[PDB]
Amino acid sequence: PHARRALCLLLGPDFFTDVITIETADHARLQLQLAYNWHFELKNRNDPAEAAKLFSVPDFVGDACKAIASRVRGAVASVTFDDFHKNSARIIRMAVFGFEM
Amino acid sequence: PHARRALCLLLGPDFFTDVITIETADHARLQLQLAYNWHFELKNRNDPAEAAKLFSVPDFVGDACKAIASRVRGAVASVTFDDFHKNSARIIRMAVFGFEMSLPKARDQAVFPQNGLVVSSVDVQSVEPVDQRTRDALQRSVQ
Amino acid sequence: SLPKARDQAVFPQNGLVVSSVDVQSVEPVDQRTRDALQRSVQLAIEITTNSQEAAAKHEAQRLEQEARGRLERQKILDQSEAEKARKELLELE
Amino acid sequence: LAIEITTNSQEAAAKHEAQRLEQEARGRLERQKILDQSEAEKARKELLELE
């Protein structure tokens, strides 16, 4: 919840070294590591309000890691293990974002 | 009920580090952690009454955590465990707020008209059974 | 809307009004009660695992039929190709 | 006693569902069998002509 405190808010391309514990529909408890290649998308750096809106969230890494952890854990628990283990990379990716392509 | 006392009422986007214990229709006692991505929605900061209405509730985090805890615990207790465990993320989310959207997924916003607090997302991570013998019997199901 | 009653109780003696009445812990007082209820949940899990393995059996039982069903058509097909050559052989024989 | 009969009504209703699922599962399986046996006759008659 709270370990690094640095005043320089890193906003460039980077990833979160995160791991999450989840349970599946077959009651097979399994935990996994995620990457989360992220960045901040400012369409107007000159704008004061939009640039100051960066610091609206006090734990942006914790907010993103928490939000996504719920999106995976919820979807994976309504899916069988043998199907997950096999086709994991697909359903885990589309569960955290988007609708179709 | 009462641990932080700070005079600076945080109103920006944040979450509540909360956990709740609930029972389901199959009498399977299981407790889980919630997130509650919240913020305050002031449509007029210049207004004195509406801005002073922020401090109407004396325990805004306790009020929201209590209110939602009842909305989950009530709905989950009238639902079977095997259905819950599988489709938890759906019913727990729509139980705390909204009515439908497209019957359908309820919405992604609960407003508290007492003070102006509004909860946007309610992420969940650990739906663990409280009883040990329960989780042992569930280990056979996966095995 | 019989229906859900409302979300407000007014006390006309003093003006107090109760809006929400959230609840969290409906726990049985007696211990032996909650122990008997622990069987209900421990029973409510085993029949779902039985319905799981039964539905899993039904699938594998279905897969058995449809697997050998197409195999049976392959057999009749292979036996047919034999007759196309056996009749030709029978003429030479 | 008022708890054990509800768990009996629970497992009885749970049995009724699995007992229903048994019938409807093998019911569609039976139609698959007759269908697969029909495709065999479509080829067996053709084979019987060559035989």
- DSSP assignment of B91-107, as one string? HHHHHHS-SB-----B-
Could you tell me which residues come within 8 angstroms of residue D43 by beta carbon, excluding any fewer than 6 positions away?
A: C73, C76, C77, C80
Alpha-carbon span B89 to A73, nearest angstrom: 8
Report d(CA B110, CA B94) in Å as an integer. 10
Evaluate whether B58 touches B114 at the Cβ level (below 8 Å). Answer: no
Which of residues 18 through 47 in chain C touch B, CB cutoff 8 A? Answer: 20-26, 37-38, 40-42, 44-46
Please give the residue of chain A at the shortest CA–CA distance from B93.
Answer: A74
Of the candidates A57, A70, A81, which has its C-beta nearest B89's C-beta? A70
Interface test with C, best of D29, D30, D49 (most C CBs within 10 A): D29
Residues 44-83 of C with CB under 8 A from B: 44-46, 48-49, 52
Distance (Å, whole) CA A47 – CA A12: 18
Q: Is A59's Cβ below 8 Å from some Cβ in B?
A: yes
Tokens at A96, concatenated: 């955290």
What are the phi and psi torsion angles at B82 (to 5°)? -60, -40
Beta-strand pair A29-34/A18-23: antiparallel
Pair A18, A33: CB distance under 8 Å: yes
Grouping H, G, I as helix, E, B as strand and the rest as coil, residue C79 is helix
DSSP output for A4-70: ---SS---SSB---EEEEEE-TT--EEEEEE---B----S-SS-HHHHHGGGGSS-HHHHHHHHHHH
| DSSP codes joined into one string, chain B | ------SS---SSB---EEEEEE-TT--EEEEEE--EEEE--S-SS-HHHHHGGGGSS-HHHHHHHHHHHHHHHHHTTS-HHHHHHHHHHHHHHHHS-SB-----B-S-EE-TTT-EEEEE--B---EESSHHHHHHHHHHH-
**Residue burial A15-47, b: 16+ Cβ < 10 Å; e: rest:** eeebebebbbbbbbeeeeebeeebeeeeeeeee
Task: Assess contact for B25 and B18: CB atoms under 8 A.
Answer: no
β-pair partners for C68: none
**How far out from the chain centre does Cα A18 lie?**
9
Q: How far apart (Å, rounded) are the C-alpha atoms in residues B128 and B84?
A: 12
Nearest to A77 by CA among B118, D26, B91: B91
3-state secondary structure of D20: helix
For residue A19, which phi and psi values (nearest 5 degrees)?
Answer: -135, 145
Name the nearest CA neighbour of B142 among C45, A27, A80, A25. Answer: A27
B16 with B61: CB under 8 angstroms? yes
User: What is the dihedral sign for C-alpha C29, C30, C35, C41?
Assistant: negative
Question: Among B134, B34, B82, B126, which residue's Cα sits nearest to residue A31?
Answer: B126
Judging contacts by C-beta atoms under 8 Å, the chain B residues touching residue C22 are: 66-67, 69-71
Q: Are A76 and B87 in contact (CB under 8 A)?
A: no
- Separation of alpha carbons C41 and B73, rounded Å: 17
Segment (H or E) for C9: strand C9-10
* Residue labelled with tokens 């009660």: C33
Q: Which helix or strand (DSSP H or E) is residue C65 part of?
A: helix C31-92
Mutate to test the interface with C, among D36, D41, D45, D49 (most CBs of C within 10 A): D36
Q: Nearest Cβ partner of D3 from C36, C48, C73?
A: C36
Which residue do the tokens 């084979």 mark? D47
| C-alpha span between B34 and B69 (Å, rounded) | 10
Q: Would you say A44 and A73 are in contact if contact means Cβ atoms under 8 Å apart?
A: no
Q: Cα-atom radius of gyration of chain D, to the nearest Å?
A: 22
Chosen from D4, D5, D7 to mutate, greatest number of chain C CBs within 10 A: D7
Joined together, the tokens standing for residue D37 give 């046996």
Chain D nearest CA to C10, separation (Å): 37
Distance CA C57, CA D4 (A): 30
Q: Which residues pair with B29 in a beta bridge?
A: B23
Among residues C55, C50, C46, which one has the least CA distance to residue D21?
C55
Mode of pairing for the β-strands spanning A29-34 and B110-111? unpaired
Chains contacting C (3 or more CB pairs within 8 Å) = B, D
Angle at CA of residue A76, ends A38 and A100, nearest 5°: 60
- One DSSP character per residue, B51-75 reads HHGGGGSS-HHHHHHHHHHHHHHHH
Q: Measure Cα distances from B57 to B61, B101, B132 in Å.
A: 9, 30, 39
Return the ∠ at Cα C54 (arms to A27 and B86), rounded to 5°.
30
Measured in residues, chain D has a length of 51
CA dist A88 → A22, A24, A64, A75, A84 (Å): 13, 11, 21, 11, 5
Look up residue B94 and give its amino acid: M
DSSP secondary structure code for residue A97 in this structure: S
The number of residues in chain C equals: 93
Q: What is the total residue count of chain A?
A: 101
Is C37 buried (19+), middle (13-18) or exposed (0-12) by CB count in 10 A?
buried
d(CA A9, CA A54): 9
Q: How far is CA B39 from the centre of its chain?
A: 14
Residues A50, A27: Cα–Cα separation, whole Å: 44
Q: How far apart are CA C42 and CA D11, in angstroms?
A: 11
Which tokens sit at D17?
């569902």
CA of A10 to nearest chain B CA: how many angstroms apart?
19
Distance (Å, rounded) from C-alpha D7 to C-alpha C33?
13
- Contacts (Cβ under 8 Å, ≥6 apart) of C2: none
**Spatial distance between the Cα atoms of A84 and B22, rounded to a whole number of angstroms:** 28
Rounded to 5°, angle at Cα A32 from A28 and A37: 145
